[PDB]
Amino acid sequence: GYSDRVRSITLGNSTITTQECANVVVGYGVWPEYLKDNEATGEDQPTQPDVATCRFYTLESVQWMKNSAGWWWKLPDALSQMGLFGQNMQYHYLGRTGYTIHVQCNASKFHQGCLLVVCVPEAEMGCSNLNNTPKFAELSGGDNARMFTDTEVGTSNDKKVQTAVWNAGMGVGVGNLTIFPHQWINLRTNNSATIVMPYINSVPMDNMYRHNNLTLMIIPFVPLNYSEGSSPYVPITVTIAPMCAEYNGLRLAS
Amino acid sequence: GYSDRVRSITLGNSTITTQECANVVVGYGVWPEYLKDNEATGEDQPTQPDVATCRFYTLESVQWMKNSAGWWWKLPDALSQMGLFGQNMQYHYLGRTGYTIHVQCNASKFHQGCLLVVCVPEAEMGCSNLNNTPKFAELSGGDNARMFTDTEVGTSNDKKVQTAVWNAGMGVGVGNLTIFPHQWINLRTNNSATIVMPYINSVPMDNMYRHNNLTLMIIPFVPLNYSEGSSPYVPITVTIAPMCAEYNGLRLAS
Amino acid sequence: NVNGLKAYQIPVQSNSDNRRQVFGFPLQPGANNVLNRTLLGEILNYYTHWSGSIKLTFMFCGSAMATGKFLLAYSPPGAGVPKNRRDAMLGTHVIWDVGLQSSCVLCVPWISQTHYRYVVEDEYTAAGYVTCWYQTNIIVPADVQSTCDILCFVSACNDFSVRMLKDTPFIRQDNFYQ
Amino acid sequence: RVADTVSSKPTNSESIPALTAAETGHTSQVVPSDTMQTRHVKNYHSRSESSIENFLCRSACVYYATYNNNSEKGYAEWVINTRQVAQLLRRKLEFTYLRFDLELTFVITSAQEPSTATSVDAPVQTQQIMYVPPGGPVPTKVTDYAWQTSTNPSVFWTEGNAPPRMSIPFISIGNAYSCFYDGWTQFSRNGVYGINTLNNMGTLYMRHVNEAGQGPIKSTVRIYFKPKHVKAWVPRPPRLCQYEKQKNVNFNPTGVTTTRSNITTT
Amino acid sequence: RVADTVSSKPTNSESIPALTAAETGHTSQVVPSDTMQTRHVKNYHSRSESSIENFLCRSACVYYATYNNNSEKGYAEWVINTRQVAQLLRRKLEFTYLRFDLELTFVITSAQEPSTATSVDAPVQTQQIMYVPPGGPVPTKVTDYAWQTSTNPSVFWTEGNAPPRMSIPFISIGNAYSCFYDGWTQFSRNGVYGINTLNNMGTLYMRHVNEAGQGPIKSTVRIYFKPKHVKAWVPRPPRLCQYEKQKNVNFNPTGVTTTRSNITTT
Amino acid sequence: GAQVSTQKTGAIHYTNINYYKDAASNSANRQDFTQDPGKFTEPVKDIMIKSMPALN
Amino acid sequence: GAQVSTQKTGAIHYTNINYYKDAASNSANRQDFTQDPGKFTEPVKDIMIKSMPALN
Ligand SMILES: CCCCCCCCCCCCCCCC(=O)O
Ligand SMILES: CCCCCCCCCCCCCCCC(=O)O
Ligand SMILES: CCCCCCCCCCCCCC(=O)O
Ligand SMILES: CCCCCCCCCCCCCC(=O)O
């Protein structure tokens, strides 16, 4: 072992290599594995698809402004339109997978900032109006980032999610969000963040279009900054890889 | 082995120590050795001169401008006037040596650039006018750098060498000049370049004033650059050491 | 930009809207207008067939305060020139980030029905494409020039071969050189 | 040959065989199974049609010189060298020092010329192609004393049969041929500079042995070299600019490659 | 290998080797000794003149192209393919995937043309038949640079001797030749559909090496293929309608068989 | 390498040598006869004997 | 002096004799393949494994 700060990951067809990174946080202490034949209840045979599904699908990018609050994604839904993971997701009826989340954000030695890369299992949300429940087009984007705000929510539109960043939108203390697995991105000494998450859920296999497994949240606790005479555009990107996929219950598409 | 990036070289009387450097490229895979008595045809006895000839003779320096094209030197001729290597070169008639080329160019973390340090064996050249052949005062400098140009050659002066950098002057593709041994100087992560070259030539021992063995070429593929408020003068220097010298055929000087 | 050394460096910027493309070209050694001249393009023209892999190396040559990530995709031919970044991310790719041994090597594997291929441009035995997209912007502190270039190397792997020796069409002679 | 491939599984360690430094002048050694997960396929290919033994040992034209039968100066001569044709010149300039044998071959041909006599009946013609090394006698006409060939090697061949062929050892002064020379010939460093300073190689003469006729016939010989036992050292990049002189390296600068209408255009 | 016969006696059992069902796609296996009582005769014949090794390995004409000696465009060329003659085409279309070698042969001929000169005395002529694989140089006249043949294989032959012959390995891209193709060439499923989508095979050039004459001579070459080591897969029914296109299967529907003037007429 | 093999008699020996490097310079394999009819005639799955009735 | 060596097969033997005095009358050494890439690729002094980082 020489020069700890360099990693390398070759999963299937893609490879992501960082030179300046921290350690790798591996789930709750387990590596994602297939489903044993002692805990299954499906009566069909599964379908370990290919290397063609365990790949590195990169999602959209965004700009880290100087007033931005935070973004998030829904994991089983963000990869709905990507390659052969989005075809075996809708043609079948069941499935279980694990992911390998990644994040890139690189700045010079004259910038500053921080971020909290964390994934929350079973993330709920709260509508703006108390009586109603949130919409769907205001809860999940089509692999495009959803963003928090500074003002709380207003009183509209009776279905919008409440983007109150200091409460996280779930109704908890934002400082206590370090229980779920995570990693910090400090531009002083960091350039990325890796996270390996297994499949955590009550039932053995669950639908993909009806119930979202996890939720990826990004929150900058310390805003960007820089003196005059430097690049004012700092973008962010994320790369995710389905790990150990399986399916059951073949039907027509939807 | 601790902190790979530091080397140290003590050859004879001089010593050159770099703290930030890359690996050392050693010829075509051989270390320079003396001439065995199974491949010699000289009937005299050789003269392994001294430590006084295997030393570090530093040549002239130049400025890396923002429009410069490239420099070069002729190796057996550039050391013609340096110390006791230039006396045993002209008093004798034969000889065979190997060199240890070195290069220094250091800039801050706010500059950028690159260079191709390569030595070519048996480097020919092309005159400006097609009929004639190049001059000598336009082909070899007296340990002073010769430089390429941007405009091709013109049509003068019927003897000038053609300084067409993108063709290298030899009549080949400049991008294919990575076959001969070499090393890059990237100011981002590099500060020097070392090269050890053995004696490569058809005959066992060859003259020194009639046939030049090698040729050292420097070409910046990415020009220098810097924002306002930094030193605008970046000089370059080279240090060469004859290795395992030998001679035969003593006569009068010339 | 062909009569100078500017035809060798890819220009990289620092821009606002992400997902900008940096470069791209089809994959055809000895056939395309980009690889038909390099060291592998001048040896591959003496033959007619070939089969193997290719190692493409890069080198970010910006200042030591520069930063950024990049994507490198190779989409086999069923439908080429992916317009968006999300169209290219489905194929084979890799993610490279700069700084401290910046140079990264993408390995184009060998994926073809037949065993060999034609150096000439043959529509039956096409190869694929190659592209690179902005995974994250180029951020820089003040007092640093934002335009930074990159050099792209190319080489062959160890499962490579050739066949059917022929004559190259580059050199052409008109009369005996007196 | 070529090597096989090996089966790879998903990994999350810190091996990173991708990121490296290119400043060290070291080509990488990454195979496809290192960067992604692949199958196991054993290659059965073989790198045989590319070795220098198989790549160079083919005959090619070098020089065709003709000689009429009309007058007392019919004979024709040629000075040996290999840089007179573009095809075989560039197939040598990917190395620096070679070493080989040769197998000559002369495909001689004939043709008639206008005349006024009533009938014509030309018997077969014969040659008589001579070789004069450097520093030796020389003929000046087709009826000279030099054509005895008391020690020179000659070849006599009658038209209508197979062409003549023969071998040649590694005849040189140095330990290997030199295709590029950097330096002059005079110790004063003046005068001739190019590669022909160390190229003499002799001469080559040809002649009609028949007395005369009524045509009279005209003929053209064609040489063919075939390097047999090659050995190459110190490769170098190929040529990019056309040839324009026989004993120089003069060129005219051209673009490095043809052009496309964009950087992102396919 | 053929088999013998066996002696049979009268029977009255329920063996019934005659009645069977033909719906099962099974050809019967009844011999004459099963249906009637016969003698015992041991056959000494042998099925040797019918195997594919002996049935295909005979030379046949493929294409004869001629080239005059008059002008600077005398040379003639041909694109390789085997579906240009009716005799050898139909002897291939009883199988689908073949695999063989070949032994070429060129029976060259000559002939005079009208002229006005007083006398004529034509020495022997020579060729010079070249082979250019796909994706290579090409000649356009009889005095071009391409005729050097630095790597191309050529054959030189003087008129009056035996004809030239040579072998050829299994040069292809797939694991066996394909005589029938069902599908297009473009992935968009548009344009060319027939069998020539996977047939290039190179070219073939021929030329007079002699300078010129007074005739001047005209010549015609004739090719001859001979598949040597055959292997056949997936037989199919022979052809019933004439050939009418070189790279199609277009036909004109005809009757299945000639006609007789009755059903019971002999 | 010379082999002394048999000849084609109605109802002796004959030598042979190869002189080249490749394998496409030898002569045809005329003296080879191998028959198998089961692929084209009788491709059925269940084996049918001619004594028993065809379909039950 | 005759040697019975191997031939070039896709995936047998073939005789050969020399008839002259010199050594320039034999045929080419086509059936010889010897590879060594280490001279041109990787001429460095310190050996570098692809797992460890390049420069520290
Ligand atoms: C009738 C027999 C005559 C034999 C003539 C021998 C010809 C010698 C060939 C010389 C080698 C070719 C030149 C190599 C290097 C050079 O001089 O450019
Ligand atoms: C002087 C030597 C020249 C040798 C020329 C080789 C000719 C190649 C023959 C190709 C195989 C015949 C075609 C089979 C299938 C098809 O393409 O229809
Ligand atoms: C080039 C071949 C010359 C004619 C053959 C003469 C006999 C020489 C002995 C050959 C024995 C080879 C082994 C064998 O019998 O197969
Ligand atoms: C001039 C050669 C004539 C043809 C050869 C006939 C065979 C004679 C025996 C040769 C044995 C030589 C030893 C060897 O096998 O290498």
Numbering used by the authors:
A (entry chain B), B (entry chain B): 8 to 261
C (entry chain C): 61 to 238
D (entry chain A), E (entry chain A): 13 to 278
F (entry chain D), G (entry chain D): 2 to 12, 25 to 69
Paper text:
Given that three key structural elements of the VP1 GH, VP2 EF, and VP1 EF loops dominate virus–receptor interactions, we systematically calculated pairwise Euclidean distances between all amino acids for all possible (n2) pairs of these three key elements from 15 structure-available human EVs, which defines a k (k = (n2)) dimensional space delineating the structural characteristics of the receptor-recognition sites. The phylogenetic tree could clearly separate these human EVs into three groups: EV-A, EV-B, and EV-C. Within each group, viruses with distinct receptors were further grouped into mono-phylogenetic clades. This structure-based in silico analysis completely matches the results of experimentally derived receptor identification, therefore, it can be used to deduce the receptor usage for human EVs. To test the robustness of our structure-based algorithm, we determined the structures of three other human EVs (CVB1, CVB5 and Echovirus 3) and put these into our algorithm. The in silico analysis suggests that CVB1 and CVB5 are CAR-dependent human EVs and E3 utilizes FcRn as a functional receptor, predictions consistent with experimental reports.
The genus Enterovirus within the Picornaviridae, a family of non-enveloped viruses with a positive single-stranded RNA genome, is comprised of more than 100 serotypes. Human enteroviruses (EV) are presently classified into four groups, Enterovirus A-D (EV-A, B, C, and D), among which EV-B, the largest group, consists of over 60 serotypes, including all 6 serotypes of coxsackievirus B (CVB1-6), coxsackievirus A9 (CVA9), over 30 serotypes of echoviruses and more than 20 newly identified enteroviruses. The capsid proteins (VP1, VP2, and VP3) adopt the classical eight-stranded anti-parallel β-barrel configuration with the N-termini residing inside and the C-termini exposed on the surface. Most of the uncoating receptors bind to the “canyon” sites of the viral particle, dislodging the “pocket factor” in VP1 and subsequently triggering conformational changes of the intact particle to release the genome, albeit that SCARB2 binds EV71 outside the canyon.
